[PDB]
Short mmCIF file of C-alpha atoms and ligand atoms in Angstrom, two decimals:
data_model
loop_
_atom_site.label_atom_id
_atom_site.label_comp_id
_atom_site.label_asym_id
_atom_site.label_seq_id
_atom_site.Cartn_x
_atom_site.Cartn_y
_atom_site.Cartn_z
CA UNK I 416 -30.90 -132.18 125.68
CA UNK I 417 -28.05 -130.15 127.15
CA UNK I 418 -24.75 -132.12 126.71
CA UNK I 419 -22.56 -132.83 129.74
CA UNK I 420 -19.68 -130.80 128.13
CA UNK I 421 -21.80 -127.47 128.61
CA UNK I 422 -22.45 -128.09 132.35
CA UNK I 423 -20.30 -127.28 135.22
CA UNK I 424 -20.44 -129.95 137.96
CA UNK I 425 -21.68 -129.15 141.50
CA UNK I 426 -23.33 -125.90 140.37
CA UNK I 427 -26.48 -125.26 138.33
CA UNK I 428 -24.39 -123.40 135.76
CA UNK I 429 -24.30 -123.92 132.04
CA UNK I 430 -21.87 -122.38 129.39
CA UNK I 431 -22.97 -121.49 125.79
CA UNK I 432 -26.19 -123.67 126.14
CA UNK I 433 -29.21 -121.53 124.88
CA UNK I 434 -30.49 -123.84 122.05
CA UNK I 435 -32.06 -126.46 124.26
CA UNK I 436 -34.94 -124.43 125.83
CA UNK I 437 -35.11 -124.47 129.69
CA UNK I 438 -32.22 -126.59 131.04
CA UNK I 439 -33.48 -128.48 134.18
CA UNK I 440 -31.49 -127.35 137.21
CA UNK I 441 -29.93 -124.29 135.61
CA UNK I 442 -29.85 -121.07 137.67
CA UNK I 443 -27.26 -119.16 135.55
CA UNK I 444 -26.42 -119.25 131.88
CA UNK I 445 -22.92 -117.99 130.89
CA UNK I 446 -22.17 -116.92 127.52
CA UNK I 447 -18.40 -116.84 126.49
CA UNK I 448 -18.72 -114.57 123.44
CA UNK I 449 -21.04 -113.18 120.81
CA UNK I 450 -20.63 -115.72 117.89
CA UNK I 451 -24.09 -117.27 116.70
CA UNK I 452 -23.06 -121.00 117.24
CA UNK I 453 -22.53 -120.08 120.97
CA UNK I 454 -25.47 -117.65 121.42
CA UNK I 455 -27.93 -119.80 119.22
CA UNK I 456 -31.43 -119.70 120.77
CA UNK I 457 -31.03 -116.34 122.70
CA UNK I 458 -33.38 -113.63 121.66
CA UNK I 459 -35.58 -110.82 123.21
CA UNK I 460 -37.80 -113.74 124.41
CA UNK I 461 -35.19 -115.22 126.94
CA UNK I 462 -36.01 -114.66 130.69
CA UNK I 463 -33.06 -116.14 132.70
CA UNK I 464 -30.05 -114.62 134.05
CA UNK I 465 -27.04 -114.40 131.52
CA UNK I 466 -23.53 -113.88 132.81
CA UNK I 467 -20.87 -112.38 130.38
CA UNK I 468 -18.27 -109.69 129.68
CA UNK I 469 -19.36 -105.93 129.42
CA UNK I 470 -18.84 -106.03 125.56
CA UNK I 471 -20.78 -109.21 125.20
CA UNK I 472 -23.59 -107.58 127.23
CA UNK I 473 -23.74 -104.38 125.02
CA UNK I 474 -24.16 -106.84 121.92
CA UNK I 475 -26.85 -108.79 123.61
CA UNK I 476 -28.65 -105.54 124.62
CA UNK I 477 -28.34 -103.70 121.13
CA UNK I 478 -28.24 -106.55 118.54
CA UNK I 479 -30.34 -109.31 120.00
CA UNK I 480 -32.63 -107.04 122.10
CA UNK I 481 -32.38 -109.17 125.26
CA UNK I 482 -33.89 -107.23 127.88
CA UNK I 483 -31.51 -105.36 130.26
CA UNK I 484 -32.97 -107.09 133.58
CA UNK I 485 -31.53 -110.42 132.44
CA UNK I 486 -27.89 -109.17 131.51
CA UNK I 487 -25.30 -109.54 134.25
CA UNK I 488 -21.98 -108.17 132.86
CA UNK I 489 -18.83 -109.03 134.92
CA UNK I 490 -15.47 -107.12 134.81
CA UNK I 491 -12.30 -109.14 133.75
CA UNK I 492 -9.49 -110.28 136.01
CA UNK I 493 -11.72 -109.82 139.13
CA UNK I 494 -12.86 -112.32 141.72
CA UNK I 495 -16.67 -112.20 141.59
CA UNK I 496 -19.43 -114.42 143.31
CA UNK I 497 -22.31 -115.72 141.15
CA UNK I 498 -25.05 -117.58 143.08
CA UNK I 499 -22.67 -118.46 145.99
CA UNK I 500 -19.79 -119.55 143.75
CA UNK I 501 -16.46 -117.72 143.09
CA UNK I 502 -15.67 -117.06 139.45
CA UNK I 503 -13.13 -115.19 137.40
CA UNK I 504 -13.37 -114.05 133.71
CA UNK I 505 -10.15 -113.83 131.67
CA UNK I 506 -9.35 -112.53 128.17
CA UNK I 507 -9.50 -115.44 125.66
CA UNK I 508 -7.51 -113.72 122.79
CA UNK I 509 -10.48 -114.65 120.38
CA UNK I 510 -12.98 -111.87 119.22
CA UNK I 511 -13.82 -108.56 121.19
CA UNK I 512 -15.41 -109.42 124.54
CA UNK I 513 -14.61 -113.19 124.41
CA UNK I 514 -13.75 -114.77 127.85
CA UNK I 515 -12.46 -118.06 129.53
CA UNK I 516 -14.11 -118.66 132.82
CA UNK I 517 -12.36 -119.87 136.00
CA UNK I 518 -14.89 -121.69 138.43
CA UNK I 519 -13.85 -122.40 142.08
CA UNK I 520 -16.23 -125.12 143.29
CA UNK I 521 -17.21 -125.48 146.93
CA UNK I 522 -15.49 -128.86 147.23
CA UNK I 523 -12.16 -127.23 146.24
CA UNK I 524 -12.09 -128.44 142.62
CA UNK I 525 -10.93 -125.76 140.18
CA UNK I 526 -12.33 -125.70 136.58
CA UNK I 527 -11.04 -123.71 133.52
CA UNK I 528 -13.48 -123.37 130.51
CA UNK I 529 -11.60 -121.80 127.67
CA UNK I 530 -14.63 -120.78 125.45
CA UNK I 531 -13.21 -120.14 121.96
CA UNK I 532 -9.61 -119.08 122.51
CA UNK I 533 -6.11 -118.45 120.92
CA UNK I 534 -3.66 -119.77 123.44
CA UNK I 535 -0.83 -117.44 124.14
CA UNK I 536 2.23 -117.35 126.58
CA UNK I 537 0.80 -114.23 128.27
CA UNK I 538 -1.95 -116.58 129.64
CA UNK I 539 0.88 -118.30 131.67
CA UNK I 540 1.23 -115.14 133.81
CA UNK I 541 -2.55 -114.44 134.68
CA UNK I 542 -4.55 -115.56 137.80
CA UNK I 543 -4.26 -119.15 136.30
CA UNK I 544 -0.77 -119.47 137.60
CA UNK I 545 -1.76 -118.95 141.17
CA UNK I 546 -3.39 -122.43 141.72
CA UNK I 547 -3.94 -126.02 140.40
CA UNK I 548 -6.66 -126.54 137.78
CA UNK I 549 -8.19 -129.97 137.95
CA UNK I 550 -10.53 -129.99 134.82
CA UNK I 551 -10.20 -128.17 131.49
CA UNK I 552 -12.99 -127.64 129.11
CA UNK I 553 -10.91 -127.05 125.83
CA UNK I 554 -11.45 -125.30 122.53
CA UNK I 555 -10.20 -128.28 120.29
CA UNK I 556 -10.99 -126.58 116.93
CA UNK I 557 -7.50 -127.11 115.48
CA UNK I 558 -6.26 -130.19 117.52
CA UNK I 559 -4.21 -131.89 114.85
CA UNK I 560 -0.60 -131.36 113.85
CA UNK I 561 -1.17 -130.19 110.38
CA UNK I 562 -2.81 -127.02 111.66
CA UNK I 563 -0.01 -124.41 111.66
CA UNK I 564 -0.41 -120.62 110.99
CA UNK I 565 1.55 -117.47 111.25
CA UNK I 566 1.38 -115.11 114.16
CA UNK I 567 -1.29 -112.35 113.93
CA UNK I 568 1.35 -109.71 113.76
CA UNK I 569 3.08 -111.34 110.69
CA UNK I 570 -0.17 -111.43 108.77
CA UNK I 571 -1.03 -107.69 109.82
CA UNK I 572 2.50 -106.51 108.71
CA UNK I 573 1.93 -108.24 105.24
CA UNK I 574 -1.51 -106.67 104.79
CA UNK I 575 -0.18 -103.22 105.79
CA UNK I 576 2.83 -103.26 103.42
CA UNK I 577 0.60 -104.78 100.61
CA UNK I 578 -2.16 -102.21 100.91
CA UNK I 579 0.24 -99.33 101.29
CA UNK I 580 2.30 -100.33 97.98
CA UNK I 581 -0.92 -100.78 95.95
CA UNK I 582 -2.49 -97.40 96.98
CA UNK I 583 0.73 -95.53 96.48
CA UNK I 584 1.14 -97.05 93.02
CA UNK I 585 -2.48 -96.28 92.29
CA UNK I 586 -4.06 -93.54 94.45
CA UNK I 587 -7.62 -94.39 92.77
CA UNK I 588 -7.45 -97.92 94.23
CA UNK I 589 -10.09 -99.04 96.77
CA UNK I 590 -9.13 -101.59 99.50
CA UNK I 591 -11.93 -103.99 100.54
CA UNK I 592 -11.88 -106.30 103.55
CA UNK I 593 -14.45 -109.23 103.89
CA UNK I 594 -16.18 -109.93 107.31
CA UNK I 595 -19.23 -112.15 108.73
CA UNK I 596 -19.37 -111.73 112.43
CA UNK I 597 -17.25 -109.93 114.99
CA UNK I 598 -13.51 -110.64 115.22
CA UNK I 599 -10.48 -109.91 113.17
CA UNK I 600 -11.13 -106.10 113.35
CA UNK I 601 -7.31 -105.39 113.52
CA UNK I 602 -7.12 -106.40 109.65
CA UNK I 603 -9.13 -103.55 108.48
CA UNK I 604 -8.24 -100.93 111.27
CA UNK I 605 -4.35 -101.58 110.54
CA UNK I 606 -4.94 -101.24 106.81
CA UNK I 607 -6.86 -97.90 107.29
CA UNK I 608 -4.36 -96.47 109.72
CA UNK I 609 -1.56 -96.88 107.25
CA UNK I 610 -3.60 -95.23 104.45
CA UNK I 611 -4.86 -92.30 106.64
CA UNK I 612 -8.49 -93.35 106.14
CA UNK I 613 -11.55 -94.34 108.11
CA UNK I 614 -13.25 -97.61 107.43
CA UNK I 615 -16.66 -97.41 105.58
CA UNK I 616 -19.46 -99.97 106.25
CA UNK I 617 -23.12 -100.71 106.29
CA UNK I 618 -25.38 -99.32 109.13
CA UNK I 619 -25.78 -102.87 110.65
CA UNK I 620 -21.96 -103.29 110.86
CA UNK I 621 -21.23 -99.86 112.18
CA UNK I 622 -23.80 -100.48 114.90
CA UNK I 623 -21.97 -103.69 115.84
CA UNK I 624 -18.55 -101.97 115.95
CA UNK I 625 -19.97 -99.19 118.18
CA UNK I 626 -20.65 -101.76 120.90
CA UNK I 627 -17.10 -102.99 121.32
CA UNK I 628 -15.30 -100.45 123.51
CA UNK I 629 -12.64 -99.74 120.94
CA UNK I 630 -10.80 -96.50 122.10
CA UNK I 631 -11.34 -93.47 119.54
CA UNK I 632 -13.73 -95.72 117.39
CA UNK I 633 -15.59 -92.64 116.22
CA UNK I 634 -12.34 -91.33 114.51
CA UNK I 635 -11.87 -94.76 112.89
CA UNK I 636 -15.18 -95.92 111.25
CA UNK I 637 -18.07 -94.28 109.19
CA UNK I 638 -21.22 -95.01 107.33
CA UNK I 639 -20.33 -92.67 104.60
CA UNK I 640 -18.73 -95.04 101.86
CA UNK I 641 -17.97 -92.06 99.62
CA UNK I 642 -15.47 -90.49 102.02
CA UNK I 643 -13.33 -93.60 102.85
CA UNK I 644 -10.80 -95.75 100.90
CA UNK I 645 -11.18 -98.94 102.88
CA UNK I 646 -14.71 -100.57 102.76
CA UNK I 647 -16.10 -103.63 104.64
CA UNK I 648 -18.39 -106.04 102.82
CA UNK I 649 -19.89 -109.39 103.70
CA UNK I 650 -17.36 -112.40 102.98
CA UNK I 651 -19.93 -113.74 100.52
CA UNK I 652 -19.26 -110.62 98.19
CA UNK I 653 -15.42 -111.25 98.07
CA UNK I 654 -15.14 -112.60 94.59
CA UNK I 655 -14.58 -111.08 91.14
CA UNK I 656 -18.25 -110.74 90.34
CA UNK I 657 -19.37 -109.12 93.60
CA UNK I 658 -16.38 -106.77 93.62
CA UNK I 659 -16.84 -105.47 89.97
CA UNK I 660 -20.53 -104.84 90.89
CA UNK I 661 -19.49 -102.94 94.15
CA UNK I 662 -17.02 -100.95 91.97
CA UNK I 663 -19.81 -99.92 89.54
CA UNK I 664 -21.77 -98.74 92.73
CA UNK I 665 -19.09 -96.32 93.92
CA UNK I 666 -19.73 -93.78 91.11
CA UNK I 667 -16.35 -93.82 89.21
CA UNK I 668 -14.47 -92.71 92.36
CA UNK I 669 -12.19 -95.75 92.19
CA UNK I 670 -10.83 -97.74 89.16
CA UNK I 671 -9.28 -100.70 90.87
CA UNK I 672 -9.86 -103.08 93.88
CA UNK I 673 -7.52 -104.88 96.14
CA UNK I 674 -9.47 -107.24 98.54
CA UNK I 675 -8.56 -109.35 101.54
CA UNK I 676 -10.35 -112.53 102.64
CA UNK I 677 -9.30 -113.34 106.25
CA UNK I 678 -9.92 -116.92 106.60
CA UNK I 679 -8.94 -119.71 109.05
CA UNK I 680 -6.72 -122.56 107.82
CA UNK I 681 -7.05 -123.97 104.30
CA UNK I 682 -4.66 -126.67 102.78
CA UNK I 683 -2.03 -124.10 101.46
CA UNK I 684 -0.69 -123.57 105.17
CA UNK I 685 1.45 -126.79 104.63
CA UNK I 686 4.01 -125.22 102.25
CA UNK I 687 3.58 -121.45 101.69
CA UNK I 688 5.15 -118.83 104.24
CA UNK I 689 3.34 -115.52 104.53
CA UNK I 690 6.00 -113.68 102.55
CA UNK I 691 5.42 -115.92 99.52
CA UNK I 692 1.77 -115.13 99.25
CA UNK I 693 0.57 -114.03 95.87
CA UNK I 694 -3.09 -112.84 94.98
CA UNK I 695 -5.75 -114.26 92.58
CA UNK I 696 -6.17 -111.59 89.81
CA UNK I 697 -8.82 -110.93 87.04
CA UNK I 698 -8.42 -107.60 85.31
CA UNK I 699 -8.38 -104.46 87.66
CA UNK I 700 -9.31 -106.68 90.79
CA UNK I 701 -6.96 -108.58 93.03
CA UNK I 702 -7.98 -110.99 96.06
CA UNK I 703 -5.50 -111.97 98.71
CA UNK I 704 -6.32 -115.01 101.04
CA UNK I 705 -4.72 -114.27 104.48
CA UNK I 706 -4.77 -116.99 107.24
CA UNK I 707 -5.58 -114.58 110.25
CA UNK I 708 -6.59 -117.05 112.89
CA UNK I 709 -8.49 -116.37 116.33
CA UNK I 710 -8.10 -119.99 117.42
CA UNK I 711 -4.93 -121.85 118.92
CA UNK I 712 -2.68 -123.68 116.29
CA UNK I 713 -1.83 -127.28 117.34
CA UNK I 714 1.52 -126.11 118.80
CA UNK I 715 -0.12 -123.20 120.76
CA UNK I 716 -2.74 -125.46 122.18
CA UNK I 717 -0.24 -128.10 123.10
CA UNK I 718 2.07 -125.64 124.89
CA UNK I 719 -0.83 -124.18 127.01
CA UNK I 720 -2.11 -127.69 127.99
CA UNK I 721 1.44 -129.01 128.83
CA UNK I 722 2.07 -125.89 131.06
CA UNK I 723 -1.43 -126.12 132.75
CA UNK I 724 -1.18 -129.84 133.47
CA UNK I 725 -4.86 -130.53 133.96
CA UNK I 726 -6.02 -133.82 135.59
CA UNK I 727 -8.84 -134.16 133.04
CA UNK I 728 -9.66 -132.57 129.66
CA UNK I 729 -13.18 -132.13 128.23
CA UNK I 730 -13.16 -131.24 124.51
CA UNK I 731 -15.81 -128.71 123.38
CA UNK I 732 -15.30 -128.72 119.63
CA UNK I 733 -15.47 -131.58 117.11
CA UNK I 734 -17.13 -133.86 119.68
CA UNK I 735 -19.92 -134.98 117.43
CA UNK I 736 -18.26 -138.22 115.93
CA UNK I 737 -16.41 -140.98 117.69
CA UNK I 738 -13.46 -140.92 115.23
CA UNK I 739 -12.70 -137.23 116.10
CA UNK I 740 -13.09 -137.92 119.88
CA UNK I 741 -10.74 -140.93 119.61
CA UNK I 742 -8.08 -138.99 117.63
CA UNK I 743 -8.18 -136.02 120.16
CA UNK I 744 -7.79 -138.46 123.18
CA UNK I 745 -4.67 -139.85 121.50
CA UNK I 746 -3.05 -136.42 121.30
CA UNK I 747 -4.02 -135.65 124.93
CA UNK I 748 -2.25 -138.96 126.15
CA UNK I 749 0.84 -138.06 124.12
CA UNK I 750 1.10 -134.65 125.68
CA UNK I 751 0.67 -136.06 129.18
CA UNK I 752 3.30 -138.81 128.58
CA UNK I 753 5.80 -136.20 127.19
CA UNK I 754 5.38 -133.77 130.10
CA UNK I 755 5.22 -136.17 133.06
CA UNK I 756 1.61 -135.26 134.49
NI1 NI T 321 -16.00 -118.20 118.14
#
């Protein structure tokens, strides 16, 4: 059954709760973003109202084939009413179309659900600043002090300079970027922009990008692999074997590959700065691991929560074992004692 952390008290609303069949009492199902863990169970066969951003609605319509009658897209930064209750959707700084939701309960309680998010100080000057928030449902993916990572902009600058140098040294080199879902689009679009190229990709991936309301998208992407010097491939193919194989496929139009695997955290975040990063190399193929994160680091999460000062925190990630829950509660108490709420 639907866990308490996916329910919003004093409404019949749920959030990211599609895998449990009909939820007893639920009149509206919110979807924070289009990642399969969160949407799991949604398909053309679902027949209840789904509330979400415009981008998330385009994906539901076109990729999942959910019937249009059940999609209720809502604009951002706008006070709306859903089944008698005031809500606001905010940018989560996660993947395209990802939202946090602010719920103003009839009793006067205010609840923020972050969805998946990468906390940022720009969130301190949104509609959140205008009133007290009593309860916070928090993306706790990286809630431990070992999880540090560079800013998105440091990582993109590194990727840009790296790609530019390599293709100026060898104008017959191909750049490959790995991908599995939506998110991290800036990696491949920034590389392409410094090389004066479109990004080539499969028909399924092009269809996905065409849903995302990216300005001038038709000038940036193509399904003609031949005509482009930055290609997208599935993350699974980003290895020496998969990359040599793809290089055979391109018809001797390129004689070298430089590939990027955008990952989350891995253990080498604890020493190495982005400037020290060096690739793995085998012959004419080089692979760079770059920690481009769309979740809060420990310090980013801690700052946001210390600013917000919630009366209660409900974790939404890593809640499946008591050891994890216990560890997270410890950090929440530390943050509260330090900041005086
Ligand atoms: Ni996500």
